[PDB]
Structures are given as C-alpha cells and as structure tokens.
Design a protein around this ligand. Sequence first.
Ligand SMILES: [Ca+2]
Ligand code: NA
Ligand code: NA
Lengths: 246, 247
Amino acid sequence: RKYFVAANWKCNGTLESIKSLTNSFNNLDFDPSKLDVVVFPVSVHYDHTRKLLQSKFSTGIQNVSKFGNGSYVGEVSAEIAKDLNIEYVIIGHFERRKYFHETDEDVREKLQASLKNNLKAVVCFGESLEQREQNKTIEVITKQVKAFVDLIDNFDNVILVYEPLWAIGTGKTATPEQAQLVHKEIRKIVKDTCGEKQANQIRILYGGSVNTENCSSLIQQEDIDGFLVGNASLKESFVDIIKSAM
Amino acid sequence: ARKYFVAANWKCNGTLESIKSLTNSFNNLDFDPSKLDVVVFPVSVHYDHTRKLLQSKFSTGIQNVSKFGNGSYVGEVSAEIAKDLNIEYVIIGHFERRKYFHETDEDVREKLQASLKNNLKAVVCFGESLEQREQNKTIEVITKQVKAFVDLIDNFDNVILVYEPLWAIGTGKTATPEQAQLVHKEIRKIVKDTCGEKQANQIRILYGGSVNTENCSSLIQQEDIDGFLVGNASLKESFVDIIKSAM
Ligand SMILES: [Ca+2]
Ligand code: NA
Ligand code: NA
C-alpha cells in the first residue's frame, strides 16, 4: 500500500494564492507511483486548481451530495463529479457533522453514491473529548466505521481518516503513540469485518493537527498511512509534510 | 422603472456537454444587459465552464453561499471567495435548502450579511406552504420571512427578492398570475413599511413558482412582478423565450 498525503484547504484560497501554492507544490519531485498526493480545493476553485497542478497530484472536492441529479439547489451530485472526472471526495469530515447536521446515514449514502459513480472517497470519523474521557473511543469509532465499511469494494479507493476531535480545539494534544493505538484498532475493525488482505490494503490517515513540527513522529507510526492536513496545507512548507511520507 | 431580472436556476443539473449546447443557444439571443438583467446559476463546479461559455451580456452566480467567512468550514464557499472570483450573485434561502438542508431564517440573515459585506448581489427566496395558504396565513408567514433580513439591505438594486409559492410547488396546485401579483404587492408593502416607500419601489421582486414559455408573459406584465427565478424551464433552449418576455 501507498502512503497518501492530502491537502484539505477547507474554506480558504484566492485565485492568486492558489497560483503561488500550486507552483510550489509542482517544484517537489516525488514519485506518484509510490505516493498518493491529493489536493482538495473549494468547489469553485477546483477547475482553477486542477489546471495548475501537474498530473503527479490527484484532486478532489470536500463534500458531495447524497442525492443524484435534480431539484437540489446548492448540491453537487456524484454524477456531476464523475462527468468532470473529479477523482476524490471527502465524506464525513467533523466540520460537516458539527455545523451542517451530517449524520452517519448521510455518510453511508454519500459513500454509496460516490463508489457507484467511481469516485474515490476519503471518509472521516472520530470521538470527542467527553467520549474519550468516558472510555468510548473504540465504541464510537467502531459505530462510525460500521456505518459504511461494508460498502468498500476496491480497498485502494476508500481511505479512512481518524479525527481526534478530543484534541482539536480542546487544549489537549494527541501523542503519536496515542494516534497509533487508535489506528491499530481501526485496522483491526477492518480486518474483522472485511478481511486480512483488505485491512492490509486500506489506508488509514491521521487527520488531527498535522504540521511541520509533528509530521515525522506521526507518519512513521506503523498504522498511520498518511494525513488529511488542514491549515499546514495552505503553506508552501506543505512540501515538507509530503517529504515526510516519501 | 425597475430593471427586469430573468434568472436561470439550474439546480443540481448539467454535464460538460449539455452546458456547451445550452449556453450556445442562450448566446444566440440578442439583448442589452444595460436594460435587462439575465443571470445563470450553474452548479458550483460548473461555474468556470459556464462563465467561459456564456457571453458577457449574461451575468452569473452561485446557488448558495456560506454564513461563515474564510476558515475551517469544510465544504463551504465563503462570500470572500466568491468576490475574489468575481462571482456577481448568490441565491439565498431557496426553499430546497430550507426543506432538505435545515436552512433557517437566521441562516438567511447571516448569509445575506456576509454577501453584502463582500459586495455580492443577493437573490433571496421565501414563500408559504399549502397548509399556511389554506389557513389564510400567507401575509403573516411572508412578513416574518422578509423581516428576518430586510433591514440588512444596504442598496435596493443589489438585493432581489423571490416569491416561491410553495403551495403551488409539488402540491398539484397551479398559481394564477392574479394570485402571484397579490402576494408581490404585499411583499412590496412589507418593504415599504420597514424600509420606506422609495426603497420598496426600487427593489426587484421576482416570481419563483413554475415558469414556462406559456405563462411568462402573463406574469411579467403584472405590476409588481419584476422577473423570474426559473427552474426546469431554464434547462431548455426555449428559456430564451422567457427572457424575451421581459424585453
Ligand atoms: Ca521515508
Ligand atoms: Na506509517
Ligand atoms: Na411587471
């Protein structure tokens, strides 16, 4: 299996800052047959960003509709994405769950729509501080993974992300050991549900706070296969995070 | 007189090929954009493709905007980002967002505030249900919806209202132009009562119920109907006939 490092730009960017960033990213010589690197711009920046990135980079969108084509103002169907050859989607990011009411039922339906339309999916989950303090880390992640995991067909084409919500905006910091222990448990869930071969094929990314300070200690953990990176991916120095995985 | 305003709301429809074909048909209509506003609202990921293919006489916008600014809001498009892209218009409050995506009056207010702060023009939708109409509560519903945001309007050319007769959308019922006009007049009165007569007389109020080539003339001729936010009919080449009704 390949390392997978993803830039989640969230709701950030200008036309000119993207020109500069993409140029910086293009200057990194890496081997895309070894390493998957994926950039997730804002929807209205996707075309702009794709045209600026060399083919060694994959691209995707940050969210996708559970509905197909039709009378759904504001939504981008998986069918539309397919017609544009958008390669990846993010599903279940904690911000969609938090601010926009996204449920486990929505995650499932979105994954089903995406795979049906040959989109590859980066699917996010993870537990809160209150949950982790009640020793519910495994309970919660098990429940969240089992909402969708039976849909996975090609285990190269769904990528899991662990988001330690307990260490996001709480004042707590996840250690690499603590991230590793969770990732090993995620892998065990996949092994038990889908198989040994499948569990050894699937990528499980760390999607907590990732930056130039901590990327090395995380990426070298046995069951951490890369990152879904937030604000550090809006920087030229994101190339060093890519390097950590090379 | 108010400048008329004809908008294509493509909702979640389109392919690269369908958009080529449709935009080419639209471009075949000669009109003067200094006298008539004609706006297309493609899916976000189709905006660059559409904007490139449409001549400059057509304005363009997006079908939704975030209430948050730039930052850690996965999946959203901020008004700042739209401004940097020169996106001219946003749709806010479309009943499908209110129905399927839980958008509230507070969200509508906050989106409009963000949009105006970022020099976007806003097409803002509201309207009552079949039960509300049957219970003779149209005016009270619409009053509440408009007053959720109307005081934010900072320029009565740059915010455009849309009356969506939800009682005549997916219910089996068909609104008459007389019924639409009666509501439009009451909407304008709401604006007059809250913002002043001059401002009420400036604002475009569009009809956002079922519009097609056959009913458009009878609607747009009504005194307080200043144009349309068009659904399915805007996915057809014959949308140009709807534009011509406003010419
Ligand atoms: Ca290495
Ligand atoms: Na590793
Ligand atoms: Na009129």
